[PDB]
Ligand code: HEM
C-alpha cells in the first residue's frame with residue numbers, strides 16, 4: 109500500500125519539517141513499519157521514501173541506475189524536490205526541462221565526473237590545510253565579537269551564521285562588504301517554502317511560489333557572479349573563484365559561464381549555511397549535555413568526535429531526489445523505470461540497525477558511521493572543509509565557554525531541503 113497520508117505529508121511537505129519531533133517520529137515510523145514505501149502526496153510526484161541507511165548507500169552507489177538529472181535526457185528530473193506546479197513553472201521558464209543550474213546536483217555521469225574534477229583536488233584534506241591558519245584567524249575574530257557582545261544572544265543570527273560565510277567569501281577573495289547580500293540571497297534560496305523568508309517580488313500564495321522564488325534568487329546570484337567570473341578570467345588570483353572562473357574542458361575551451369555560476373551558487377549557499385546549522389545544533393546539544401562540554405574542554409582531541417556526532421544529529425541536508433532509469437527491486441519492493449526517490453539522509457542517520465540508541469547524542473561512537481554528507485559520486489565535495497571549519501571553530505570557542513543555556517524557543521527553517529536552526533536564544537557562561 110501507499111504510505112499513510114499523514115506520515116507522507118510530514119516528510120514531503122515543507123510545513124512537515126517545521127518541528128523536528130513529529131518529523132523524526134514519521135521517519136522512525138517508516139524505518140520500523142514501512143522502510144521502503146511510496147508517498148503519494150497531493151501536488152507531488154509519487155516518491156519512494158528512502159529511510160534506511162543501507163538503502164541510501166545502495167541507491168547512491170549506483171548512478172547508472174538512479175540518476176540525479178534524468179541521465180541522457182538532461183534536466184528531466186529535478187534533484188531537489190519541488191511540488192508539481194513548481195516543476196511546471198521551471199519547464200515553462202527553461203523550455204521543457206528542470207536543469208535551472210549547471211551545479212553538481214543537476215549532473216549525471218560522465219558530465220558530473222568532468223565538472224567535479226575541476227575542484228576535486230582543491231577540496232581534499234591535504235589541499236585544505238594551507239587554509240587552516242586563515243580559518244582559525246576568522247574563528248578567533250568571530251569569538252572576539254561573541255565575547256564583546258555579552259552572554260545573552262541568538263546563537264544563530266548573532267554568531268553561528270557569520271564565521272562560515274566569511275570563510276567561503278575569503279576563499280572566493282570576495283570583499284567582506286558583499287557578505288550581507290550573499291547572506292540575504294542564501295535566506296531567499298533555502299527559505300522558498302518558509303513563511304518568514306518570502307521574497308517581495310514573488311506572489312507568495314501562488315501554487316508555484318517556491319519555484320518562482322528559487323528561480324528569482326538564482327537570477328540574482330547569476331548577476332553578481334557574472335561580474336566575478338569576468339573579473340577572475342581577466343585578472344586570475346590564487347583563490348577558489350579563479351579555479352572555478354578559468355576552468356577549461358579537455359578541448360581547452362572555458363566551461364560555459366553557467367558551470368562557474370553553478371559552483372558559485374552551491375558554495376555561496378550550501379557551502380556555509382550547512383556549517384552554520386551544524387555549529388548551532390552542536391551548541392544546542394552542549395546545552396542539553398553539559399557533561400559533553402566539560403569532557404571536550406578536558407580533552408580537545410574529542411572535538412572531531414563532537415563534530416561527527418553534531419553532523420549525524422543535525423543532518424541539515426535533508427534530501428536529494430533520484431529517478432530510476434530502469435526497474436529495480438530493493439527490500440522486496442518493485443521500483444519502476446521513471447519512479448522518483450527521495451533520499452532521507454536525516455532518517456538514515458537515525459537507523460537503529462546502524463546506530464545504538466540513535467536519538468542519543470553520543471560522541472563515543474567510534475567510528476561514527478553518519479551519512480550526513482551522503483554517499484556515492486555526489487557525496488558532499490565540501491565534507492573536508494566542513495569538518496575543518498567546525499574543528500577549528502570548536503578548538504577556539506569551547507575553552508571560552510563554561511556553560512550553554514537555551515533561554516528561549518528554538519526556531520527551525522521550514523524546509524524539506526537544507527534546514528536547521530534559524531534561531532537559538534542562549535545564555536552563555538564564559539570562563
Ligand atoms: C555540515 C556541512 C555540510 C553538510 C552536512 C553537507 C551535506 C551535503 C549533502 C548531504 C550533499 C548531497 C550528497 C549526495 O547527493 O549524496 C551535499 C552536496 C554538496 N555539498 Fe555539502 N554539506 C556540507 C558542507 C558543504 C560545504 C562546506 C560545501 C562547499 C564549500 C559543500 C558543497 C557541496 C556541493 C557542491 C554539493 C553537491 C555535490 C554533488 O552533487 O556532486 N557542502 N552536501
Ligand SMILES: Cc1cccc(Cl)c1
Pocket residue numbers: 211213373374377378425526
Ligand atoms: C545541499 C546542496 C549542495 C549543492 C547545491 C545546493 Cl543548491 C545544495
